Amino acid sequence: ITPVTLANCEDEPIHVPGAIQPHGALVTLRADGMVLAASENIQALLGFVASPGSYLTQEQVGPEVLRMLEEGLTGNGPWSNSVETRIGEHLFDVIGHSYKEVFYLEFEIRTADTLSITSFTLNAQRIIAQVQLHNDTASLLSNVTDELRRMTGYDRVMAYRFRHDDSGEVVAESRREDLESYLGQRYPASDIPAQARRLYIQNPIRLIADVAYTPMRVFPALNPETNESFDLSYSVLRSVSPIHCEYLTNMGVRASMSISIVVGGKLWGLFSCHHMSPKLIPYPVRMSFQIFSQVCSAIVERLEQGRIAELLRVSTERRLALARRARDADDLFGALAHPDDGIAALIPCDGALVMLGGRTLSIRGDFERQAGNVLQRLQRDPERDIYHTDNWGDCCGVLAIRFHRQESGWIFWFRHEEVHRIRWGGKPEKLLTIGPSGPRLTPRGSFEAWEEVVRGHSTPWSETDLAIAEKLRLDLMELCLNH
């Protein structure tokens, strides 16, 4: 019965809302096919009253439907299927699935004049051609963002990248003129709490037909079998958190639809479509996006590792240049401090320090004091050959490696505090009408929430950045020992 406030919202059970969106009806069955619960609108949408204890009957739901249901009813492992069928006055999409051991049948009115197979195929071809045309991982995102809008007619579609700390950044955008831009918006990991994030990962597509909707409750609330709520995780019609709804209306959005990009076990980022009036996307089309989601995820994965590959390649090429120079010139300092192949170019940094013997070369600033303090901190830890941190002198980020012990051969890279890369301003943008929860649920409030998180922090060191440092360290050890 608990109200969901700003304090609660982190722990909101959004998977068991026990209600569904109004653009469809829902019937929940148990293993034997016996009805356990239904949305309060089954009668109003489909001509009949589903009742707990009942079993579904032909042409109160039609034949092919039970035909489908029986197949999944007798199959081990998460059944999933859909049928198209006429029930009374209308034809329906009857998407059905089984999660836990409860079976779900979802009913959407089908208004499309097209054959489903071809509608599905047509859109799949169109939206994944965008995945064959681009080598830049950012062109991919940018282009499919522009294309998703062309296909769906959404007012605004955005592509979100998720950082290491699960904070988000709007990296692409295609929007109708009128609308303010959110390009470069960065948002925290909290803007999408655990359960919501778990769900985007498990579900390629989420659709919100109308944010201003009144939910259609499924009765009864609790599954008699367990005396605990129905887990609508894989339910297409599952209802929305009032918090998110308030957020979206603060923005002035009325319909959403998001396509996930999952790589590893991580939500790599999603495409968020936003409409200013309510909007619906037919089932077969959503399936076009679902399959797309899986392929795009695959290509983004490769494109990203193709990116790291090239980073490693030019790094070694520079380690080669470095090895070449060092042996022939015989001062390392000159080699390391080289303007372009120098260490400052090896790994993205705002500065670097080279330190062998008693001599100190600070390149791109005065870093001698910091390096001294960092080194003192490592006093307590004589065995550390590598040190790094984004919390901390005057530079937040530090990556230090040791290549000579006795003569204190050290290398440092430094990073300043992370800064909002792109920022809007210039003319006060319009007044958002703000709900009861407060300004926290506006983009402006989200951004501020993000600042408070990152400030005091430099950008984390790449998986890649550390790998390079490690290779460099090996190089110099080799050199110093060798000659």
Ligand SMILES: */C=C/C1=C(C)C(=O)N/C1=C\C1=NC(=C\c2[nH]c(/C=C3\NC(=O)C(C=C)=C3C)c(C)c2CCC(=O)O)/C(CCC(=O)O)=C1C
């Ligand atoms: C207390 C937890 C939450 C805060 C704070 C908050 O802002 N939202 C919170 C809970 C959820 N958010 C969910 C999804 C979600 N989050 C945002 C916020 C942004 N995304 C952006 O890209 C930007 C700016 C560029 C912002 C400000 C949005 C738009 C959404 C909608 C999901 C989508 O776009 O697909 C969320 C899950 C929602 C769901 O159930 O679909 C929760 C629970």
